[PDB]
């Protein structure tokens, strides 16, 4: 009977541990589902915005080019004024 | 009643196997959570990086329009002087 009492007590300890682990697993499932939703959202948002890397680099090059053209005109004008000084 | 102890012994062993298997499932979920947390921070920064490119793109476009106006104004001054 003492082996029987020992087995019965341990089985009840196992049943409580099964429930405890399950509650912890329930929480982790909710975390995983929320992270999955957030990651899918962020992934879509990044993809829709990806074009701006390309457009930024193209726009910057265009800006640098017209700035160079403008500076050339400014130099021509300054020279023409100084030639007439 | 030795076969009765066997019976209960069998039930306890199954409970311990199911318990261990839940733990193994938890281990996999903790790994999932860690990988997702990393992927989400990475994606959040990458989205933020695209937002910086968007801001800078619009700022470059604004600068380009202003420089174009300035160039037209200089071109006019030159035209007045060369006429």
């Amino acid at each position: 009977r003492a082996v029987l009492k020992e087995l019965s007590e341990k089985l009840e300890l196992a049943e409580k541990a099964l429930a405890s682990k399950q509650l912890q697993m329930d929480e982790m499932k909710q975390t995983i589902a929320k992270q999955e939703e957030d990651l899918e959202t962020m992934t879509i948002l990044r993809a829709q915005m990806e074009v701006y890397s390309e457009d930024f680099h193209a726009e910057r090059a265009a800006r640098e080019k017209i700035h160079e053209e403008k500076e050339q005109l400014a130099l021509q004008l300054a020279v023409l004024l100084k030639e007439n000084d | 009643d030795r076969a009765v102890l066997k019976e209960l012994s069998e039930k306890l062993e199954l409970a311990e196997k199911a318990l261990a298997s839940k733990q193994l499932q938890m281990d996999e979920m903790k790994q999932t959570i860690a990988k997702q947390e990393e992927d989400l921070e990475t994606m959040t920064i990458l989205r933020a990086q695209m937002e910086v490119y968007s801001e800078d793109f619009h700022a470059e476009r604004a600068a380009r329009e202003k420089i174009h106006e300035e160039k037209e104004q200089l071109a006019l001054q030159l035209a007045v002087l060369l006429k």
Partner: peptide, 29 residues
């Protein structure tokens, strides 16, 4: 059963335990 060693933290647990007393992992995990 008798005492059993936790296969993660190496602590030797009492026969009555089903979870490790240190790390709470089940004996067969």
């Amino acid at each position: 059963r008798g005492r059993w060693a936790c296969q993660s933290c190496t602590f030797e647990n009492e026969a009555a335990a089903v979870l490790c007393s240190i790390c709470e992992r089940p004996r067969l995990a």
